Amino acid sequence: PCMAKFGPLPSKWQMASSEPPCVNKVSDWKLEILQNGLYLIYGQVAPVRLYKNKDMIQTLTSKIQNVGGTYELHVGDTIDLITYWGIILLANPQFI
Amino acid sequence: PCMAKFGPLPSKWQMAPPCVNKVSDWKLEILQNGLYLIYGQVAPVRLYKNKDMIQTLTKIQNVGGTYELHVGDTIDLIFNSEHNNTYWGIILLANPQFIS
Amino acid sequence: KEPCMAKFGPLPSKWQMASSEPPCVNKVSDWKLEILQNGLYLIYGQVAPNANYNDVAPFEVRLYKNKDMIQTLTNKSKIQNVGGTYELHVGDTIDLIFNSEHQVLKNNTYWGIILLANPQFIS
């Protein structure tokens, strides 16, 4: 099941069975999508900006402290977080 | 794994026994009890389950959450006015026998 | 077969379990569960507030992970989803806690949990 997490400091990018990889790290807190699909971004900023490509998809400040949600992402798509977050591929139907 | 998506225009109902059955634009019926994840995006108003409002949107926002749904339920995304990087979809996550 | 999951309520249902072999969760008490298995879990649910509640204690409904509040609900006028996706470890508990027991309608309130993955990375 394709997953990744970055990471809690001093953890960096970690990765679970990427074969073929669905995801590829870019810098810190940032990866790139290699494979179209429905993904679940999760993460935490406790006991901040989530970005898909150039614009913001979540802005944690606020009744819960969980980052992310479910999103269709496509090849070359980036996610950046501007304490961890990770991603899991749920499905790749037809059609995305 | 059973899922369906509507839009973005001019795409319609895209579908992947079925767990869901389209009704018309933006609207589907649930054919299977289960735990479902509804997702999507509204690029600028409300999500319904059997005529009751479950989310209301007012920037591009996220549609959905996780919902147990039963045979017969419908899911609709309604706009005040027509006047579209807008889509929504559903994936079936599980069907434990305790969802009925 | 699977995913491993559990649900509490709505009343009269208590803890119900599916795909418990081998178990990922242990019931601890009403509305409260223990994690048996490290994992990526998705927590979901419905809180139905008593919109006519008006006793002494202030209104608030909370989801906890151990001693940390992870979701707080103070609007008594609408039925609200609870949960999220979390990395969870053996001995973590998740509990859903009402400031007083008539702040919620328990015949329409529940929460459950599903195991999405164990990456062989968390802890």
Side-chain angles (χ1 to χ4, degrees), chain A residues 38 40 52 56-58 68-72 74 90-96, chain B residues 1 3-5 14-16 37-41 60 62-63 87 90-91 93:
Chain A
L38 228 216
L40 178 21
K52 172 172 141 84
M56 156 200 42
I57 50 166
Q58 206 186 307
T70 305
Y71 310 85
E72 259 170 40
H74 315 277
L90 302 180
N92 14 215
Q94 301 17 122
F95 98 37
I96 135 135
Chain B
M3 70 193 271
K5 179 203 203 171
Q14 304 138 268
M15 288 217 207
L37 202 314
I38 296 176
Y39 71 92
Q41 141 179 152
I60 292 171
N62 292 26
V63 15
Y87 61 84
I90 197 169
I91 200 267
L93 282 200

